[PDB]
């Protein structure tokens, strides 16, 4: 009821499925035993031409994160103004006022750094989307759901032997044959020794 890879053609030495797809065996075992999604196709035309509108919409969410950040930062500024106003409206000790001004800076730092962490997350998902290509891997298992619910129409990804069957379907043998003929003819080094 679901496809299954033959074990002789995956766990050999050298692995024939790894050579036929240019995938490492440590990545092949992550794919076919349900540990990492693999991109199996990507529409290059839609991702090429709608890239500007997609990054323009991405800047909207980035500025929404920055706007909630500066709103909480203004809240922390008004809160620390209220602390240093109402505590210092009367006579007070010095070191507790130092601790109050320190804790205000601590909560402001917490706000801007939580915002920095989620800003880096939103940068990372877009940097992952902009370099999409088949025979990749997504080991995160949360980033793939973020790529499926958002920009989920530009590609396809799967797990296991049905994804390996889909990669074998879209596999033009003559292109890889001519490229492997040309690498050993022109280039040299470890790249030539591998391509044989």
């Amino acid at each position: 009821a679901a496809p299954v890879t033959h074990i002789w053609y995956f766990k050999g030495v050298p692995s024939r499925l790894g050579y036929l797809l240019d995938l490492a065996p440590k990545d092949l075992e992550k794919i076919i035993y349900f540990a990492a999604y693999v991109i199996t196709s990507v529409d290059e035309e839609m991702r090429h031409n709608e890239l500007s509108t997609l990054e323009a919409e991405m800047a909207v969410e980035r500025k929404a994160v920055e706007d909630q950040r500066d709103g909480e930062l203004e809240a922390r500024a008004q809160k620390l103004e209220a602390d240093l106003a109402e505590l210092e409206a009367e006579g007070a000790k010095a070191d507790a006022r130092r601790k109050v001004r320190d804790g205000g800076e601590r909560e402001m730092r917490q706000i801007r750094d939580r915002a920095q962490r989620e800003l880096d997350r939103l940068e990372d998902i877009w940097s992952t989307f902009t370099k999409l290509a088949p025979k990749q891997l997504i080991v995160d298992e949360n980033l793939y759901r973020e790529l499926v619910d958002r920009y989920g129409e530009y590609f396809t990804g799967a797990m296991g032997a049905e994804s390996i069957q889909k990669l074998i379907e879209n596999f033009d043998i003559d292109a890889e044959a001519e490229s492997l003929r040309d690498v050993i003819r022109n280039g040299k080094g470890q790249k030539k020794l591998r391509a044989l």
């Binding site: 440590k26 035993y33 540990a35 080991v139």
Partner: protein, 55 residues
């Protein structure tokens, strides 16, 4: 705690080739429920079933 709050991040990206341990680490990521959340989930289930029947 950068290291302490790292190696916690770098833990969930390893293979763990024993499949039983892989299944246990997979099911560990969902939290439990209290005594009154299951009531809300069951109400949502029964409402959705009635709506699909009326559909």
């Amino acid at each position: 705690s950068e290291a302490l709050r790292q190696a916690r991040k770098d833990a969930e990206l390893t293979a763990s080739a024993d499949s039983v341990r892989a299944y246990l680490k997979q099911i560990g990521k969902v939290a439990l429920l209290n005594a009154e959340e299951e009531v809300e989930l069951a109400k949502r289930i029964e409402a959705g079933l009635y709506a699909t029947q009326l559909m």
